[PDB]
Design a protein around this nucleic acid. Structure first.
Ligand SMILES: [Mg+2]
Ligand SMILES: [Mg+2]
Ligand SMILES: [Mg+2]
Length: 210
DNA sequence: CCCGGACCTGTGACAAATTGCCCTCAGACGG
DNA sequence: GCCGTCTGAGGGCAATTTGTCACAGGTCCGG
């Protein structure tokens, strides 16, 4: 199945994308890498890849596509837009998109890689952002360990403002995404909290391969 | 002493958003 | 050349998930 690879600069970039948008982003990165920035997505291919009907596939592409407008990417800083021209459909079931050519060197560079089947059942986009970052530290055999800072998680992933209250951080982001990964990917994940005084400052993730 | 106050935790409520589903009907193709 | 079938571009839904905040209940500090 398709092997996604990406610069660590992208894994650790600041952005806010939906699941549907991240799914499309994986194929653009695949298309570009197998080579101006103009990519294409076929409705019938997307539906087969992610096990959707053609109808719901069409709905997912169209709304994702119109929600890219105004979205920006930050590399730690420097900010760029994803698209420099609106999308358009020359043929029925076919969309043409114009990716910002200045993003190309950030896609292909110190790199991250995973097969698309590892993530295609994840639902929560924050859970995607997390499985990508853990992969950045994975070993050939399949294990790894990493300490991520809470302020850095909140910015890079662009968690919503109320998750600056730690019990909400735990309840609606950390626990759910650890469960999805354990339930929807071939990885088995655990964690522990690092504290300093009364404040919890980092999260230490351990994982192995099933 | 014990207070009011500034931290921290977890849970119950509700609002806002997203999920996979359902229905309609016209376009492109081929037999 | 007409029509039958597969597509996909639209319109919606109720059931769940995600985002937000009041309130109960722990600690330590300092005047
Ligand atoms: Mg959808
Ligand atoms: Mg009680
Ligand atoms: Mg009290």
């Amino acid at each position: 199945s398709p092997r996604i690879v990406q610069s660590n600069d992208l894994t650790e970039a600041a952005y806010s994308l939906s699941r549907d948008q991240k799914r499309m982003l994986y194929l653009f990165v695949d298309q570009i890498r197998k080579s101006d920035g103009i990519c294409e997505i076929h409705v019938a291919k997307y539906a087969e890849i992610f096990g959707l009907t053609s109808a719901e596939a069409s709905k997912d592409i169209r709304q994702a596509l119109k929600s890219f407008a105004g979205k920006e990417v930050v590399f730690y800083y420097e900010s760029f837009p994803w698209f420099i021209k609106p999308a358009h459909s020359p043929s029925r079931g076919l969309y043409s998109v114009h990716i910002n050519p200045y993003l190309i060197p950030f896609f292909i560079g110190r790199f991250t890689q995973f097969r698309l089947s590892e993530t295609k059942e994840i639902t929560n986009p924050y859970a995607m952002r997390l499985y990508e970052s853990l992969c950045q530290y994975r070993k050939p055999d399949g294990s790894g360990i990493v300490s991520l800072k809470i302020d850095w998680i909140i910015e890079r992933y662009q968690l919503p403002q109320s998750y600056q209250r730690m019990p909400d951080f735990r309840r609606r982001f950390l626990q759910v995404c650890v469960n999805e990964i354990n339930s929807r990917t071939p990885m088995r994940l655990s964690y522990i909290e690092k504290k300093k005084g009364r404040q919890t400052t980092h999260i230490v993730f351990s994982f192995r391969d099933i």
